[PDB]
């Protein structure tokens, strides 16, 4: 018989050995095992396609130690059986006549599954048949990547725009009479198979593809017929990383020899394996350049819609009209949806991650869609993708976060009526690994949204090598100080909510008051002292987990007031009070480069000018920002569940490749 | 009062009053209240204040963003007991233009554990590094042991749990205003238990945190508060549990005013890692040989016991389990260990295949101090491979640099999606991979009836570690080697030598074997075709083992061994697989009991030459020169029993690795 597909071949003097070898495999030859006793040296010959590596511990005679091992490899497929050969000639002590000779006849067979492991936009061969089985993060790492299909049976037509999925090439090569003996099996674990789909084009250039592997088929058989098989398969991921799926999927090809005796089972001779990582879902901070501006113009194409639309024009950003959904709560375009992206070397896909807390959504061409499951569905439930803010890229005590860090609001401690993100959604976020999430304390808010006490704005200081962002933070203490400063100047008669109409103040549950009155409202100060404490707790957290300094923080005067949650049934109405903005929150701004669309506060007016608007411009306009105040008081004070003119902005995906990070 | 503020804004008109939690940095904006004319300042503080003027009689220059962080070293004795004064100066004016004052009160609120793994709780200077668990010799992070013992009172012998100390200090007029809340996430709470010894009787303990309590309130009254808590894990790492559990103490001030809610001022968090379940290879020294003597002490148990005494190892009798299939002690249980700096716990991991209703009684009374832990499984058939008996630990190895100081778990499975393939269930496989410290290796054993790799491979401990070598040897079955040996014997004229010579008629007939001469064996075409198939399977594993354990041919020794292919008949015929599986033809020489250099090898009853087995002679020629002392076990019935039938089995408890698992980098 032939010593085929064996890691070690025992050489023989009487008769030669014949073996069939899969390309890339190392065969160890025990040269000293069959060496006569007299021998003390040998000479080794080989054909061209054979690579001989003698181990440690013109004719060239090498010493025959005990043991003496030499590993043989085959570089290219054999053109015919036994078309390569190795000969070991043993020599006795001082005779010059060869004592004996051992002969090996090799046939080289190629069976390789190859993918784009070097992330150069093409399927590249991997010489290291062991390294191709690993997926390593970092600039020195490697590993093919797989994109989740974000487009909303046994055969499917994929057009050329969608055929930008990952590529996996199966190459089989060798003498026909050898290849005919075996069959191939492309397979993966059943768990893995339920996490991606493999399609095979039925004919070259055919838009028609057959699902060879998928959730219902973890094994696909291929018949070898002596030709030099060359087939490209197309894989697509079906789900982002999750708590039970690290994102790694392996595919293998196994060589099988059907049995010639029914009693004897069939035999397995070789297996090659490749690895894909499912690219994670990456969220984009507001410091990134705006590209599109989606507005849920809820029959209110004026005020917010008109000014926001104008703002995007100033910032060179497109506007897309979103259609209101009757089955969804108000402000669903931002509280229940988020712009994100998932990247691979061959294609970048931007999409909406939707977290229905309650299906018709029409995006600009090329923008994907994906639904993430939620568990809590309250009106003020903090278990929505809206309870999330992405910090700009930062560097905390060495460790880099080039894609920023997701920030999620929860209850700092197990409060009696605390609220927080569900396990399902939090687990989804933590599994992406590339924007290490940070827990913030926003349970004191009624909405739970951190955009009501903080907001990031882009600076061009990175030209000088600076951080390139600023953190704006609500500070009731700064507003009280400003109002007290105006009082010292004699402007205590100035009135908050001055240029506002009674049908708006009364419907929005606010009443106008002078600087002297607010600075005398004792309950209002106790409430704003409570909020000031909450904000400083988040200030200490943010400075820690984002590596911020006080030079990065700009306090913005902002007042709040504590009110019960009344937009839900009384049976589930929390007894405690939650914070709501007293006047339109200045930190809920629309950031578009240096153009800032800030909500108009309607603060006390001095010489016909809002003192809050004047102070905000004094703070930011010297930094190069263009404040543009949006006059819609009804929209900015709308209830938690009521309908408002919503807005959500698509932004440029990070230029940094997420796979070059080291989580 | 700017109590617990990250930044304090100074003022020349009035001083600031603040409470500072020990270990926290308060940033001071000196330039904010600096008079415009000023170009320099002087900063003084009290002994307990640490002032770090950091930014990009002594006068320091006053830059535009002049910032300084103040820290407190020890708790304040009384409110405002410590002060910092910044005096600002104008240009060419000896008179100080102004002064700002801050009053600091230092409060300690620290939750501390043994993060440096020296068996004692240690204060953590870095309040943010203690939240991290870092692997490796330069890492840190406290460790937790699972409870493997088969209000609550716990004796001192069982009081070897992990310790978590809570310390609070500071003036009482301040502490009395707040309360503590020791808590953990709801999910984490369901992974461990925290007990607090009552101040009355130390032997009695109260469950402050557990699977039904993720928050526990303590009222802060006195100047000083110190309480020690004892933590135990309840389950090893799994697919739904990385092994990290954190506990935090939050400082809460109650709100007298009904309209305003309570306020959170500070939180200290510590992190524990649950120590994984580590399996031991047979190259480690034996301590106890457990034997399930199924009402038969003649061949197997009698020999094993004598080998155990010869090897300086105790012997422990195992009560036979009437509700479990035979060989359960070997096939359904494994001796593991979980290690912590304070304590190492050896235990038995049982994967009961015997059924979902395998019931109320677990008749295993191990030696004192030996734990017990059940791992659930999915497949419970007779020839199933979904059990901890389908597991072999490799010796410590190095593969392309990456080290495996605890060895590598090896699991049998179907290499490819066979038509009737078998493997470990997801549940068991996930449990094993979750341990991370013995990174599993998938091997091909679906071709054997039992699925056990012990029937084709065995590790034996060499003492060449004194010579800086690997310290083990890999014995591998070789049907080809056995044929070559038999052919040599035929060539010498011994073709008449008879396999199974010294065995009686009742033995062969009951164990389904027929004596044959060497001439007959070498003639049996089906036997050659059956062992050629087994040769192909083993050679595939040989490549896997060399790659994933960094082995060379010098590490491998071929042991002559023959097999045969048979249909699984020990089960109902309606569930009988169509295919054939390999079984040892004559007693498997590799299913040996390894105790140091004393090797208990099954007696093969091979062809005899001059009244001596040639298989025993070959085995001794191979291994005795390497220092091993072979001792053949004569029990033909035991080593040829069917899959489900009763056997005299053994399971040896061995020394846990010396290497501390937490010092490796998976």
Author numbering:
A (entry chain A): 7 to 63, 71 to 165, 177 to 382, 390 to 694
B (entry chain B): 8 to 63, 72 to 165, 179 to 694
Quote the study that presented this structure, word for word.
Peptidyl arginine deiminase 6 (PADI6 or PAD6) is a poorly understood member of the PADI family that is crucial for early embryo development in mice and humans. Canonical members of the PADI family catalyse the post-translational conversion of peptidyl arginine residues to citrulline in a process known as citrullination. However, PADI6 does not yet have a confirmed catalytic function, with its classification as an arginine deiminase based on sequence conservation and genomic co-localisation with the other PADI family members.
Like hPADI2 and hPADI4, hPADI6 crystallised as a head-to-tail homodimer. hPADI6 possessed a similar domain architecture to hPADI2 and hPADI4, with two N-terminal IgG sub-domains from residues 1–121 and 122–303 respectively, and a C-terminal α/β-propeller domain from residues 304–694. As for hPADI2 and hPADI4, the hPADI6 dimer is formed through contacts between the C-terminal α/β-propeller domain of one monomer and the N-terminal IgG subdomain 1 of the second. Ca1 is coordinated in hPADI4 by two glutamic acid residues initially, followed by a glutamine residue upon Ca2 binding (E353, E411, Q349). These Ca1 binding glutamic acid residues are not conserved in hPADI6 where they are replaced by a alanine and methionine (A362, M420), rendering Ca1 binding highly unlikely. Only the asparagine is not conserved in hPADI6 where it is replaced by an alanine (A382). The aspartic acids (D359, D482) and histidine (H480) are conserved in hPADI6, and structurally align with the equivalent residues in the Ca2+-bound forms of hPADI2 and hPADI4. The catalytic cysteine of hPADIs 1 to 4 is not conserved in hPADI6 but is replaced by an alanine flanked by two cysteine residues. C675 is still far from the active site centre however and would need to move approximately 9.1 Å to be in a similar position to the catalytic cysteine of Ca2+-bound holo-hPADI4.
